[PDB]
Amino acid sequence: SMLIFVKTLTGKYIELEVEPSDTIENVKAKIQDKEGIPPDQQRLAFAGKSLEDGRTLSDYNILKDSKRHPLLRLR
């Protein structure tokens, strides 16, 4: 597992555990599960880069070591 954070457009922080093999779709589903935001309406970005459907987190070089927890932002 690895910890990531997600900031909503409400400004609220969410915490998720993910695997580097998780796809963007899986993440949006977790956001839906925790916040009730439809996948279809979530535009996830990391450091201003849009995260596209059917890639993994590892495809974007988001996930480093366990000590560093990336903040994804909804836009």
Partner: protein, 115 residues
């Protein structure tokens, strides 16, 4: 405790986030992240600012949270900045970029925990 600044978690194994007590009911908390929420006093640390040498988690400019140690405080325009050291390097962080892990908050409960 109303009007007081606080760091508090809202989930059993979550992080502690900075906010304000808006009402005693559990306590009604407005988090600096804008989320409003009634949280147990058990989960509220009444420290403000987070004291020197506390181990915290802070959002770096590269959009990673990671652990560091509070080394200083600065209050400008009413806003609080923390100087936080990470592997020997110090940077300044806005209050809302500094949170506590469950373990990091647990270490403050005895001294600062509400109750």
């Amino acid at each position: 405790f109303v009007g007081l600044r606080v760091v508090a978690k809202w989930s059993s194994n979550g992080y502690f986030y900075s906010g304000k007590i808006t009402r005693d009911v559990k306590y009604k908390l407005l988090f600096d992240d804008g989320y409003e929420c009634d949280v147990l006093g058990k989960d509220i640390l009444l420290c403000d600012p987070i004291p020197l040498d506390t181990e915290v988690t802070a959002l770096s400019e590269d959009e990673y949270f990671s652990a560091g140690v509070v080394k200083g405080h600065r209050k400008e325009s009413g806003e609080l900045y923390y100087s936080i050291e990470k592997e020997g390097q110090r940077k300044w962080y806005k209050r809302m970029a500094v949170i506590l892990s469950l373990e990091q908050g647990n270490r403050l409960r005895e001294q600062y925990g509400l109750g």
